[PDB]
Write an enzyme that holds these catalytic residues in place. Structure first.
Site, PDB file in Angstrom:
ATOM      1  CD  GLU A  78      -1.301   0.103   3.686  1.00 59.52           C
ATOM      2  OE1 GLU A  78      -2.482  -0.280   3.480  1.00 59.52           O
ATOM      3  OE2 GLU A  78      -0.901   0.517   4.798  1.00 59.52           O
ATOM      4  CB  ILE A  81       1.089   9.863  -3.095  1.00 58.47           C
ATOM      5  CG1 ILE A  81       1.010   8.522  -3.846  1.00 58.47           C
ATOM      6  CG2 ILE A  81       1.925  10.868  -3.952  1.00 58.47           C
ATOM      7  CD1 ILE A  81       0.182   8.622  -5.149  1.00 58.47           C
TER       8      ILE A  81
HETATM    9  C1  LIG Z   1       4.393   4.425   6.133  1.00 56.72           C
HETATM   10  C2  LIG Z   1       3.547   3.393   6.808  1.00 56.72           C
HETATM   11  C3  LIG Z   1       4.120   2.598   7.795  1.00 56.72           C
HETATM   12  C4  LIG Z   1       3.360   1.614   8.457  1.00 56.72           C
HETATM   13  N1  LIG Z   1       4.000   0.860   9.426  1.00 56.72           N
HETATM   14  C5  LIG Z   1       3.343  -0.123  10.114  1.00 56.72           C
HETATM   15  C6  LIG Z   1       4.001  -0.891  11.067  1.00 56.72           C
HETATM   16  O1  LIG Z   1       5.198  -0.743  11.295  1.00 56.72           O
HETATM   17  N2  LIG Z   1       3.307  -1.858  11.760  1.00 56.72           N
HETATM   18  C7  LIG Z   1       1.983  -2.088  11.514  1.00 56.72           C
HETATM   19  O2  LIG Z   1       1.434  -2.984  12.155  1.00 56.72           O
HETATM   20  N3  LIG Z   1       1.315  -1.334  10.551  1.00 56.72           N
HETATM   21  C8  LIG Z   1       2.001  -0.353   9.839  1.00 56.72           C
HETATM   22  N4  LIG Z   1       1.323   0.396   8.892  1.00 56.72           N
HETATM   23  C9  LIG Z   1      -0.121   0.064   8.605  1.00 56.72           C
HETATM   24  C10 LIG Z   1      -1.261   1.003   8.306  1.00 56.72           C
HETATM   25  O3  LIG Z   1      -1.556   1.702   9.488  1.00 56.72           O
HETATM   26  C11 LIG Z   1      -2.402   0.026   7.970  1.00 56.72           C
HETATM   27  O4  LIG Z   1      -2.039  -0.840   6.907  1.00 56.72           O
HETATM   28  C12 LIG Z   1      -3.749   0.662   7.639  1.00 56.72           C
HETATM   29  O5  LIG Z   1      -4.767  -0.288   7.879  1.00 56.72           O
HETATM   30  C13 LIG Z   1      -3.818   1.122   6.184  1.00 56.72           C
HETATM   31  O6  LIG Z   1      -4.746   0.323   5.485  1.00 56.72           O
HETATM   32  P1  LIG Z   1      -6.245   0.847   5.216  1.00 56.72           P
HETATM   33  O7  LIG Z   1      -6.235   1.607   3.936  1.00 56.72           O
HETATM   34  O8  LIG Z   1      -7.252  -0.335   5.199  1.00 56.72           O
HETATM   35  O9  LIG Z   1      -6.651   1.769   6.394  1.00 56.72           O
HETATM   36  C14 LIG Z   1       2.010   1.390   8.152  1.00 56.72           C
HETATM   37  C15 LIG Z   1       1.442   2.213   7.151  1.00 56.72           C
HETATM   38  C16 LIG Z   1       2.194   3.202   6.476  1.00 56.72           C
HETATM   39  C17 LIG Z   1       1.534   4.070   5.422  1.00 56.72           C
HETATM   40  N1  LIG Z   2      -1.943  11.117  -1.042  1.00 53.25           N
HETATM   41  C1  LIG Z   2      -2.589  10.005  -1.450  1.00 53.25           C
HETATM   42  N2  LIG Z   2      -1.936   8.781  -1.339  1.00 53.25           N
HETATM   43  C2  LIG Z   2      -2.601   7.585  -1.537  1.00 53.25           C
HETATM   44  N3  LIG Z   2      -3.931   7.599  -1.860  1.00 53.25           N
HETATM   45  C3  LIG Z   2      -4.608   8.780  -1.976  1.00 53.25           C
HETATM   46  C4  LIG Z   2      -3.950   9.993  -1.776  1.00 53.25           C
HETATM   47  N4  LIG Z   2      -4.863  10.969  -1.954  1.00 53.25           N
HETATM   48  C5  LIG Z   2      -6.059  10.423  -2.242  1.00 53.25           C
HETATM   49  N5  LIG Z   2      -5.924   9.054  -2.274  1.00 53.25           N
HETATM   50  C6  LIG Z   2      -7.048   8.116  -2.529  1.00 53.25           C
HETATM   51  O1  LIG Z   2      -7.238   7.383  -1.304  1.00 53.25           O
HETATM   52  C7  LIG Z   2      -7.482   6.033  -1.577  1.00 53.25           C
HETATM   53  C8  LIG Z   2      -6.985   5.222  -0.416  1.00 53.25           C
HETATM   54  O2  LIG Z   2      -7.789   5.521   0.722  1.00 53.25           O
HETATM   55  P1  LIG Z   2      -7.898   4.450   1.907  1.00 53.25           P
HETATM   56  O3  LIG Z   2      -8.643   5.113   3.054  1.00 53.25           O
HETATM   57  O4  LIG Z   2      -6.502   4.004   2.282  1.00 53.25           O
HETATM   58  O5  LIG Z   2      -8.835   3.272   1.369  1.00 53.25           O
HETATM   59  P2  LIG Z   2      -8.440   1.884   0.635  1.00 53.25           P
HETATM   60  O6  LIG Z   2      -7.126   1.409   1.106  1.00 53.25           O
HETATM   61  O7  LIG Z   2      -9.548   0.905   0.944  1.00 53.25           O
HETATM   62  O8  LIG Z   2      -8.457   2.115  -0.882  1.00 53.25           O
HETATM   63  C9  LIG Z   2      -6.678   5.773  -2.866  1.00 53.25           C
HETATM   64  O9  LIG Z   2      -7.153   4.667  -3.606  1.00 53.25           O
HETATM   65  C10 LIG Z   2      -6.852   7.064  -3.629  1.00 53.25           C
HETATM   66  O10 LIG Z   2      -8.007   7.002  -4.449  1.00 53.25           O
HETATM   67 MG   LIG Z   3      -5.555   2.191   2.034  1.00 50.22          MG
END
Ligand SMILES: Cc1cc2nc3c(=O)[nH]c(=O)nc-3n(C[C@H](O)[C@H](O)[C@H](O)COP(=O)(O)O)c2cc1C
Ligand SMILES: Nc1ncnc2c1ncn2[C@@H]1O[C@H](COP(=O)(O)OP(=O)(O)O)[C@@H](O)[C@H]1O
Ligand SMILES: [Mg+2]
Length: 147
Positions: A78, A81
């Site tokens: 994931e 940006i």
């Molecule tokens: C830069 C970055 C670092 C992360 N580091 C960790 C980590 O060290 N340990 C962990 O358990 N999750 C980590 N995460 C997990 C995010 O908090 C998690 O995947 C979150 O659920 C994002 O997915 P979502 O779009 O469903 O919310 C990290 C995410 C990002 C963007």
């Molecule tokens: N700075 C950014 N970086 C990553 N995704 C972004 C950014 N700005 C807007 N988005 C939008 O956010 C979505 C991700 O949101 P998120 O809450 O993580 O849901 P999911 O992981 O289920 O797609 C991307 O698919 C994109 O459409």
């Molecule tokens: Mg996401």
């Protein structure tokens, strides 16, 4: 060893609550893309460059993790940006160059420590991407094809 790693994929929705809730949106690629990562790209947090469709190239962090949900031990990927987008970009092609490794995955005991960690990874990535060896990748033809 397999850095810089270049890949492209459709931006797709994930499951559970999006990390938009934390003000840190994370874009997903289809399983096909993650499956083609070399094995030596271990789990952890990486940094690099990204663009969406034909847009400009921006700094990014990528999290590579284990997926709890698929048969075999499948990874997840994931990308956040460091650019404020005016709207979502589901379905668009995200182009990424993963240039460096920040840290292994870590276990956190609260959302407070998790959010602080992620913010720190972002700030550190922004600094590291200024190094001449990484700054130049922004200009790679990889990104020029998409414009
Ligand atoms: C830069 C970055 C670092 C992360 N580091 C960790 C980590 O060290 N340990 C962990 O358990 N999750 C980590 N995460 C997990 C995010 O908090 C998690 O995947 C979150 O659920 C994002 O997915 P979502 O779009 O469903 O919310 C990290 C995410 C990002 C963007
Ligand atoms: N700075 C950014 N970086 C990553 N995704 C972004 C950014 N700005 C807007 N988005 C939008 O956010 C979505 C991700 O949101 P998120 O809450 O993580 O849901 P999911 O992981 O289920 O797609 C991307 O698919 C994109 O459409
Ligand atoms: Mg996401």
């Amino acid at each position: 060893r397999h850095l810089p790693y270049f890949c492209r994929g459709q931006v797709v929705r994930g499951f559970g609550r999006g990390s938009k809730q934390l003000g840190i949106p994370t874009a997903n690629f289809p399983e096909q893309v993650v499956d083609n990562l070399p094995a030596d790209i271990s789990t952890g947090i990486y940094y690099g460059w990204a663009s969406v469709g034909s847009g400009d190239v921006h700094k990014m962090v990528v999290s590579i993790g284990w997926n709890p949900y698929y048969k075999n031990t499948k990874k997840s990927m994931e990308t956040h940006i460091m650019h404020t987008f005016k709207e979502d970009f589901y379905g668009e092609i995200l182009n990424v160059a993963i240039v460096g490794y920040l840290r292994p995955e870590k276990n956190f005991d609260s959302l407070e420590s998790l959010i602080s960690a992620i913010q720190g990874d972002i700030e550190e990535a922004k600094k590291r991407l200024e190094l001449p060896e990484y700054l130049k990748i922004k200009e790679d033809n990889f990104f020029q094809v998409s414009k």
